[PDB]
Design a protein around this nucleic acid. Structure first.
Ligand SMILES: [Mg+2]
Ligand SMILES: [Mg+2]
Ligand SMILES: [Mg+2]
Ligand SMILES: [Mg+2]
Ligand SMILES: [Mg+2]
Ligand SMILES: [Mg+2]
Ligand SMILES: [Mg+2]
Ligand SMILES: [Mg+2]
Ligand SMILES: [Mg+2]
Ligand SMILES: [Mg+2]
Ligand SMILES: [Mg+2]
Ligand SMILES: [Mg+2]
Ligand SMILES: [Mg+2]
Ligand SMILES: [Mg+2]
Ligand SMILES: [Mg+2]
Ligand SMILES: [Mg+2]
Ligand SMILES: [Mg+2]
Ligand SMILES: [Mg+2]
Ligand SMILES: [Mg+2]
Ligand SMILES: [Mg+2]
Lengths: 114, 109, 338
RNA sequence: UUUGCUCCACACAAUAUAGAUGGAUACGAAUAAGGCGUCCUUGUGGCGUCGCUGAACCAUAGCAGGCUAGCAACGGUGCACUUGGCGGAAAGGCCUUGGGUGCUUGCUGGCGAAUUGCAAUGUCAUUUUGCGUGGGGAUAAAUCAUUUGUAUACGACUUAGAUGUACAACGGGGUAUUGUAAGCAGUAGAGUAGCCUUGUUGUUACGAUCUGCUGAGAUUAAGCCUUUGUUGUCUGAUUUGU
RNA sequence: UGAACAGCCUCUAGUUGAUAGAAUAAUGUAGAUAAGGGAAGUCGGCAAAAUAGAUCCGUAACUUCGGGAUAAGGAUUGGC
RNA sequence: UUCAAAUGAGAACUUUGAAGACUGAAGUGGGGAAAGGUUCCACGUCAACAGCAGUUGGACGUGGGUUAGUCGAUCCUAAGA
């Protein structure tokens, strides 16, 4: 979701030219990261091995307002809310079928190269 | 070396506000002073005395003085310090003229 | 490029109304300290064009040229050419073999030179490194010349002379994004024009159903490579020479530097080239002065030029004194005392 | 930056194949002319021969090629070790010298093969990569952040920065702009109103303005130049391996 | 201040509300300036510029005798 | 528009102080007619609403508040009905 956003040098480390600083999204995500860390501590998981094994954002139901346009017209003015879920996990670390020719060849190799 | 320190500087606001829109000369002077304090003291938290704000605004939004004599004191941030444990406090120095003055380390200890 | 100034000289052009008469001419001063020879490159002819075969470097490289090989000099361990300098260990056998390869092959020989930017009033500190072709003598003699000139300096008087036609190659002054009116010189549209008049009204016919490559359109103006030619050298000044700005007619002991210095550049402490007219590029910009590609016999070339007077008044305003002594003589004693 | 990186050798595993299955076997020119051999007096020479296709030439036999005994000649081939010489058009190959070490079908013997069951590519090459083993080798940068403005819409560009022609903020000087600051004084000032002993440039009050200190004062890089002064600053983050 | 309930500045009272931060490319919208020429521009002086208050001079054709008329065209203006 | 403090989990926007400005009395002041209908005021309070935000609000929740012989209506007639 990046069309006609601006360019910056801070996207070099990711191999892109288009990157931003969405503060509200970051604050919500780090609130949920704090919750997952606290849940891991309550479960007794080692904090140093934790990594974001699953994270997923879904579209929540939209919230409607109205905007007023020229010539007495009315358009939608909607929020695009989010469902966010994330899971942090600990890091952790043949029958052969040969024909008669194949079997005879293998036996011949065995008795020739010994 | 020692972190708590007070020095008096002269800031040249004329060259910093050169060509700035008239309705933002004084606000830009405020931000310029905060940048000046951060440069000289290395403190992201810079606090301006209200009498310094008065001195900045003394001749309106458009008439900031060419030069300003500042007393900048880096102090320890007590009472639940923020991201950094030091902050700069900027005060106006009562001088007839802000010309001809060099940076001086002021100690009253 | 340091700046520009003014000269007065007698015109020597029989048939002209100003023959044997004084003319005022603008000149461009180029600060040219000696360049340091630090390597040689051999070039072989191939059916696909000219190809570099090998490069031989000098034993010792200064920090100003080693900076050219770094993006973060202050942070680096500065290892550049340290293992290469070991090829000069016993007798430089590897160096000799590479120079022999250049002599045997390599129909074209070029040296690597770098500027002594520390001798200019520039803040850069990072020397400019360029390849310069060697002309004259056999290929072996060219390689030998580079050999004894490694780590040595070459002054500008050994390359250029008075009255010589030379060429200036430089990147022009940048102006960023520009509209068609000033980028291409198109006509301004009438005042009554709705939605803008600094435009080209019709950028194409219906067919071909495309905007042609030849239509004037807005974009980058300036910062282009330009090779301007046929600039006559008016003075090869010497840095270690008091009265650089003096002529035989003037004889006032003064340097080429204007009062207050060249604006945005500084002072001329080195050798310099004074060329008639103006050259591409702005002040402080690196410029390459090339010898003429053809022999010019237009009688505008091969015309000996003798300067009568060089203007050194301040360029930071309407400067009306050539020297501080002249200013003191005119004004007298001031409240300031020395 | 996990005992990372790199080269060499062998061991395993994976990966794929625009498609091995004896050998890409090297003059240059002309074609109403040439090649080769030979001789001479060395030529645009004499003589002879050849082509009419590579249907050639070279390689070619051995459990996919085993084991072993000789004869004859001192040849032919492979492998490392080698002595050099040449090759830059994309050289990365070509010509060599000298021993060693195998094979030799140049010629004679002796032993083995079977049942893959009457065929089933019947697997014999070679890009690339990873994991191992044991032997050498070397010991950086770039980006973000900060910074400059020779650059610039943003990206991009161009500069600077770990103790110094270091950088910065001030200060000093130069340069430049305006046009003589404030303050003080004046026997300057059209005068007017008072007060006197009406001085013979008397006092008081108001008075645009004028004169001196004063080409003074102010401003001066913000994209001016310069600096033996003062004060400070100088290891934060990210990533990259043949 | 001024002729003035004009414009401009201030007192009482009221407000300091209109998404903000950074940077100053092109093209815009609004506001301006311009050497020499002076309508050659354009359908067309569109747009802009020029004029402008007050005092004193001086005002033609024509006219329904009321006007035209601020015709036209000039001079002066501070402070003490 | 700016500085500081207070409050608050959170302050460019709330409150207080300080400063800089504006409306400049045919006002951005003080009242009323039509119209609205509780929007007035207090306490609590921020899910939605406020062109961002919000601890604030003409929002949300709960309450309080409009006192006449003399001010009006009520009476008279108007064009009319
Ligand atoms: Mg697009
Ligand atoms: Mg867009
Ligand atoms: Mg965009
Ligand atoms: Mg709308
Ligand atoms: Mg409507
Ligand atoms: Mg400007
Ligand atoms: Mg229009
Ligand atoms: Mg100039
Ligand atoms: Mg507004
Ligand atoms: Mg004009
Ligand atoms: Mg004019
Ligand atoms: Mg026309
Ligand atoms: Mg016409
Ligand atoms: Mg008009
Ligand atoms: Mg008329
Ligand atoms: Mg606000
Ligand atoms: Mg909101
Ligand atoms: Mg209320
Ligand atoms: Mg309520
Ligand atoms: Mg009554």
């Amino acid at each position: 979701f990046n069309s006609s956003i601006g360019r910056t040098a801070q996207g070099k480390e990711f191999g892109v030219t288009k990157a931003r600083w969405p503060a509200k999204s970051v604050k919500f995500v780090q609130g949920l990261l704090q919750n997952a860390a606290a849940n891991a501590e309550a479960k007794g998981l080692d904090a140093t091995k934790l990594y974001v094994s699953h994270i997923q954002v879904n579209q929540a139901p939209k919230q409607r307002r109205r905007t007023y346009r020229a010539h007495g017209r009315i358009n939608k003015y909607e929020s695009s809310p989010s469902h966010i879920e994330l899971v942090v996990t600990e890091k952790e670390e043949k029958v052969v079928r040969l024909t008669s020719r194949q079997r005879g060849r293998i036996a011949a190799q065995k008795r020739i190269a010994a | 070396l020692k972190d708590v320190v007070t020095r008096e500087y002269t800031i040249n606001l004329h060259k910093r506000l050169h060509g700035v829109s008239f309705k933002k000369r004084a606000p830009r002077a405020v931000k310029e002073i905060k940048k000046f304090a951060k440069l000289h003291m290395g403190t992201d938290d810079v606090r301006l005395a209200p009498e310094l704000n008065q001195a900045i605004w003394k001749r309106g939004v458009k008439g900031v003085e060419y030069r300003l004599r500042l007393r900048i004191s880096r102090k320890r941030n007590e009472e639940e310090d923020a991201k950094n444990p030091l902050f700069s406090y900027v005060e106006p120095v009562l001088v007839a003229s802000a010309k001809g003055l060099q940076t001086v380390v002021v100690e009253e200890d | 490029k340091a700046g520009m100034t003014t000269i007065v000289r007698d015109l020597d052009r029989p048939g002209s109304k100003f023959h044997k008469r004084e003319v005022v001419e603008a000149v461009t001063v180029v600060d040219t300290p000696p360049v340091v020879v630090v390597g040689v490159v051999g070039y072989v002819e191939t059916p696909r064009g000219l190809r570099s075969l090998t490069t031989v470097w000098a034993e010792h490289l200064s920090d100003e040229v080693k900076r050219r090989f770094y993006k973060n000099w202050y942070k680096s361990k500065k290892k550049a050419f340290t293992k290469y300098s070991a090829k000069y260990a016993q007798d430089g056998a590897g160096i000799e073999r590479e120079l022999a390869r250049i002599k045997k092959y390599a129909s074209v020989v070029r040296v690597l030179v770098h500027t002594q930017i520390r001798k200019t009033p520039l803040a850069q500190k990072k020397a400019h490194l360029a390849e310069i072709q060697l002309n004259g003598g056999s290929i072996s003699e060219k390689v030998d010349w580079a050999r004894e000139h490694f780590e040595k300096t070459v002054a500008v008087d050994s390359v250029f002379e008075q009255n010589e036609m030379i060429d200036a190659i430089a990147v022009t002054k940048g102006h960023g994004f520009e509209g068609v009116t000033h980028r291409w010189g198109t006509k301004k549209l009438p005042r009554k024009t709705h939605r803008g008049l600094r435009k080209v009204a019709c950028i194409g016919a219906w067919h071909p159903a495309h905007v042609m490559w030849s239509v004037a359109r807005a974009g980058q103006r300036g910062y282009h490579s330009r090779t301007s030619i046929n600039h006559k050298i008016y003075r090869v000044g010497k840095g270690d020479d008091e009265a650089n700005g003096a002529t035989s007619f003037d004889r006032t002991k003064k340097t080429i530097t204007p009062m207050g210095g060249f604006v945005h550049y500084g002072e001329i402490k080195n050798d310099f080239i004074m060329v008639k007219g103006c050259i591409p590029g702005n002040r402080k910009r690196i410029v390459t002065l090339r010898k003429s590609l053809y022999t010019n016999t237009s009688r505008k070339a091969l015309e000996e030029v003798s300067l009568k007077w060089i203007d050194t008044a301040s360029k930071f305003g309407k400067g009306r004194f050539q020297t501080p002594a002249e200013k003191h003589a005119f004004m007298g004693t001031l409240k300031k005392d020395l």
